[PDB]
């Protein structure tokens, strides 16, 4: 995640193993139950896309759901690209590039790039955009997996 250091700057720090394991354990115990979404939300505080793929990729089991989510993440990403067209002409030397759906999904962007966008002024909340897609896709799952 990207956290604030004592000095008063935003720097990246790694997520903790008993945080990781707590994510694992939630999924083990409460599967598709709604409490998973606030839980997720708390444990995703200050998290990167990269950390969010890590969390999704580290799941075991419920592979039908994991595939449905993936496909929702790509749909929501396809929709990001649709709604926000690429911008006019070449990229400025003085500036950094606008993200695509796949940069938001973490796929085409690097960590330093993910830190550029979030730490820069104005900052862009690429975590929160992926977060809604995850929560939206979580609703899809919850609604389906209701019996």
């Amino acid at each position: 995640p990207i956290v604030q250091n004592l000095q008063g700057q935003m720097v990246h720090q790694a997520i903790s193993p008993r945080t990781l394991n707590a994510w694992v354990k939630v999924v083990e115990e409460k599967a598709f139950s709604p409490e998973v979404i606030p839980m997720f939300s708390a444990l995703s505080e200050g998290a990167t896309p990269q950390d969010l793929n890590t969390m999704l990729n580290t799941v075991g089991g419920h592979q039908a759901a994991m595939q449905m989510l993936k496909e929702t993440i790509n749909e929501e990403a396809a929709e990001w690209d649709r709604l926000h067209p690429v911008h006019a002409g070449p990229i400025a030397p003085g500036q950094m590039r606008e993200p695509r759906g796949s940069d938001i999904a973490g796929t085409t962007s690097t960590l330093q790039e993910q830190i550029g966008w979030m730490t820069h002024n104005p900052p862009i909340p690429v975590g929160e955009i992926y977060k809604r897609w995850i929560i939206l896709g979580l609703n899809k799952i919850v609604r389906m997996y209701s019996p």
Binding site: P34, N139, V142, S146, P147
Partner: protein, 74 residues
């Protein structure tokens, strides 16, 4: 399971039923106004005849502690 499929048993305490209702209501994602409509409507409708009778006597304007204490002996 769908919210329409939530119903009170003939021997089931209302209380155990109301818990089931707001759990399933907890998995419904609809507008608040619709969920208010579901609350006043579906809860009583799928309630058992003995308690249903009781709840009809509370009239409208009733709140959950009063419904929950009203159908306790049933």
């Amino acid at each position: 399971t769908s919210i329409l499929d939530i119903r009170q048993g003939p021997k089931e305490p209302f209380r155990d039923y109301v818990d089931r209702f707001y759990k399933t209501l907890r998995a419904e994602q609809a507008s608040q106004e619709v969920k208010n409509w579901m609350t006043e409507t579906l809860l009583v409708q799928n309630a058992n005849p003995d308690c249903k009778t009781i709840l009809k006597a509370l009239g409208p304007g009733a709140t959950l502690e009063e419904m929950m204490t009203a159908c306790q002996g049933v």
